[PDB]
């Protein structure tokens, strides 16, 4: 059916939105390395900021896996 | 997606509330941290001899 077929392309396309979090997470844990190499005494406070950035970044990434599964199964 | 099966949702909502909000909390209350004991060796309400 043209609907069951289009659900595969639509769910496949919306998954590309995860590529944004693959790159955004690399920047956070990349800046944590740079930021910790300069002021290693703030290690515990820096890491607190990395997790906050990691969460907010991957948040936008799962909103895509949301629609990817909202289309594939919930429709 | 079984997550979207809204018929058994009440089977997950209640016991979580019975676990996150009652039981586990009732075990943290039973994990108390006492102030460490450093009673100072300087406590003497004294006074000069009677003059």
| B4 touching chain A per CB within 8 A | yes
- Would you tell me how many other CB atoms lie within 10 Å of the CB of residue B25? 11
Closest residue, chain B, to A68 (C-alpha)? B1
A72 neighbors A13 (Cβ within 8 angstroms) = no
Closest residue, chain B, to A72 (C-alpha)? B1
3-state SS assignment for residue A2 = helix
Which residues in chain A are closer than 8 Å to B4, comparing Cβ atoms?
A: 73-74
Which residues in chain A are closer than 8 Å to B6, comparing Cβ atoms?
A: none
Q: How far apart are CA A11 and CA A71, in angstroms?
A: 6
| B2 touching chain A per CB within 8 A | no
First to last CA, chain B: 91
**Structure letter (DSSP) for residue B2:** G
Structure determined by: cryo-EM
Q: How far apart are CA B3 and CA A68, in angstroms?
A: 15
Domain ranges of chain A: 2-73
DSSP conformation letters of A10-67: HHHHHGGGGHHHHHHHHHHHHHHHHHHHH-GGGHHHHHHHHHHHHHHHHHHHHHHHHH
CATH superfamily, with its number, for domain A2-73: F1F0 ATP synthase subunit C (1.20.20.10)
The helix (run of H) or strand (run of E) holding residue B51 is: none
Sorted by sequence, the CB contacts under 8 Å of residue A11 that are 6+ apart come out as A67, A68, A69, A71, A72
């Amino acid at each position: 059916d043209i609907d069951t077929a289009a659900k595969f392309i639509g769910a496949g396309a919306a998954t590309v939105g995860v590529a944004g979090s693959g790159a955004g997470i690399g920047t956070v844990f990349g800046s944590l390395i740079i930021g910790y190499a300069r002021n290693p005494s703030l290690k515990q406070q820096l890491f607190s900021y990395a997790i906050l950035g990691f969460a907010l970044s991957e948040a936008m990434g799962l909103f895509c896996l949301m629609v990817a599964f909202l289309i594939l199964f919930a429709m | 997606m079984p997550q979207l099966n809204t018929t058994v949702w009440p089977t997950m909502i209640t016991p979580m509330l019975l676990t996150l909000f009652l039981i586990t909390q009732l075990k943290m209350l039973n994990t108390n941290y006492h102030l460490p004991p450093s009673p100072k060796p300087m406590k003497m309400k004294n006074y000069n001899k009677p003059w």
